[PDB]
From a paper:
The coronavirus 3C-like protease ([name]), also known as [name] ([name]), plays a crucial role in processing two polyproteins (pp1a and pp1ab) encoded by the virus RNA genome. Inhibiting the catalytic activity of [name] has been proven to be an effective strategy to block coronavirus replication. In this study, we have identified mutations in [name]-[name]-2 [name] that confer resistance to WU-04. To understand how these mutations affect the WU-04 sensitivity and the catalytic activity of [name], we solved the crystal structures of these mutants and aligned them with the crystal structure of the WT [name].
It precedes the C-terminal tail (residues 301–306), which is involved in [name] homodimerization. When S301 is mutated to a proline residue, the Φ angle of P301 is fixed. Consequently, the C-terminal tail cannot be rotated and is restricted to a conformation that cannot contribute to the homo-dimerization of [name]. This finding indicates that the [name] mutation destabilizes the homodimers of [name]. The [name] mutant showed a significantly decreased dimerization ability (Kd = 17.81 ± 7.32 nM) compared to the WT [name] (Kd = 0.94 ± 0.21 nM). The ΔG value changed from –124.75 kcal/mol with the WT system to –103.90 kcal/mol with the [name] system, indicating that the [name] homodimer is destabilized by the [name] mutation. Compared to the M49K and M165V mutations, the [name] mutation had a moderate effect on the binding affinity between [name] and WU-04 and only caused a slight increase in the IC50 of WU-04.
Residue numbers in the entry:
A (entry chain A), B (entry chain A): 1 to 303
């Protein structure tokens, strides 16, 4: 038993991390087959980042201007191109450690593991949710650009995130592996607004189900509610509106615990209106929203 | 910036996990050099676990009764012995993926990464603290026995924990890699008391320092205190007593932030006496105690 925020084992991804240097900017790249992926602002000076013209800057870079280091061995760069906000460096050698992989663009509220890296070396691994405003609340210190977020399905690694930016508010922004930013953000050092950071309602619900399964039951109440009546409450508390698709994906959790999804919604409603009274749920003193229903089910073998 | 609970990259440990079967009991083993380490209760039936005589049970096992599977290939068992509560299976083949490693017995309040495994396959990775009562609050579902806890120092893996038991209260107990239990626990299915689960004061302090460094400053107060006067408060709230060694290890955090350790103690005292008033610190609505000072410093490059 027990329930923990848990990242996927990072070994398949560790073997793909490289160091990419252009001029005096060094960050992390991802080495899959004979292509190295990294943030295009590897080509920028600190002054360039205030307002860069990436096309003009890249014009002045040749293959030999990109230094790519996997551990201590050289990769020879035989080609480069810019796909949206990522650079694709063609190298002379296929990574022998390349796993089965796909590139995925994930949906807001979905979760993934981040392998925080520094200078091409993995430093740590932790679980992240893509917030509804398309930021993540990570731990990205200097030199962590190019670190990636991924999910693993048996032996297939789905890369979904590459770290690019910290916004002036201290949250983090980045792209999928085709270089398209999540959210309205740009790789420029300017003030950028994340909208309201609303709570991922379907995830809080799944986590309450996890709590019940693990024997935390105090918040279970005597009320039920309706979808619209809950959403009326959800909107006041900046909760994502709940939809019948969300109800559907909670079905197996509802079936295991015998608690109808709308009864759990009514318990959540009372928690939002009354607070938690200094109690905890699964060791937390607030409502956790970075576990998807799939995350919960992976840790509840009864489902 | 940002601050996250973060485990070490698990790749060096993934390559050492194997599946160990004896009779119809299957759990995880750790394959280092030509020896496989696993919980000795792999040899027990469910009925045996109520009150096992491990010596008598092992008498009836030969080398060929232990089935060891690394992925899909066989390991040939050429010897077995019982070191305290672990079995050491000598196999015919040195693991080619064996990293540099040591066996360490960790101190209460120290932290480590757990690679949760099932049937020899890594499932996830998360950070744990050894509680002062020598339990951990993990996520260990059926078949996770033998999963290990470790720390990594550049390229050296320090194994410190092997999972053995869930106590009837839902917390977890286990051994070091010489098979000596942490705490007073035994590998028998009986009621076993963990004492009072006190809070790791020095860790809460380090995490408050991390909060300051990350710009969470509201709880900083105008008071200072004394070691004995703080401990007087600590004891009432079941906090571990603070010692001059603890003050010493917080020194670099005190130096970076300019906040004397006893001023931070006074801020903590006010938090314990007044609560957090529905505010958060580093996104948490309670005081976190599973970050050591070393953990914090690894994520605060200014220290």
């Amino acid at each position: 038993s027990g329930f923990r925020k848990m990242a996927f084992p990072s070994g398949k991804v560790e073997g793909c991390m490289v160091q990419v240097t252009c001029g005096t900017t060094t960050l992390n790249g991802l080495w899959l087959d004979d292509v190295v992926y990294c943030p295009r602002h590897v080509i920028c000076t600190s002054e360039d980042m205030l307002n860069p013209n990436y096309e003009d800057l890249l014009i002045r870079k040749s293959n030999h201007n990109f230094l790519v280091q996997a551990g201590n061995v050289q990769l020879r760069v035989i080609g480069h191109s810019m796909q949206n906000c990522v650079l694709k460096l063609k190298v002379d050698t296929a990574n022998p450690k390349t796993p089965k992989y796909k590139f995925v663009r994930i949906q807001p509220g979905q979760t993934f593991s981040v392998l925080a890296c520094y200078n091409g070396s993995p430093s740590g691994v932790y679980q992240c949710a893509m917030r509804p405003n398309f930021t993540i609340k990570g731990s990205f210190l200097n030199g962590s650009c190019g670190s990636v977020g991924f999910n693993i399905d048996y032996d297939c690694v789905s890369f979904c995130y590459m770290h690019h930016m910290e916004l002036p508010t201290g949250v983090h922004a980045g792209t999928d592996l085709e270089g398209n930013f999540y959210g309205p953000f740009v790789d420029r050092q300017t003030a950028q607004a994340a909208g309201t950071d609303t709570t991922i309602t379907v995830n809080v619900l799944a986590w309450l189900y996890a709590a019940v399964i693990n024997g935390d039951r105090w918040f279970l109440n005597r009320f039920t509610t309706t979808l619209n009546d809950f959403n009326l409450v959800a909107m006041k508390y900046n909760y994502e509106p709940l939809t019948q698709d969300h109800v559907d994906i909670l079905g197996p959790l509802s079936a295991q615990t015998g608690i109808a999804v709308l009864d759990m919604c009514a318990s959540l409603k009372e928690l939002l209106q009354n607070g938690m009274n200094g109690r905890t749920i699964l060791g937390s003193a607030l409502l956790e929203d970075e576990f998807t229903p799939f995350d919960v089910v992976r840790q509840c073998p009864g489902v």
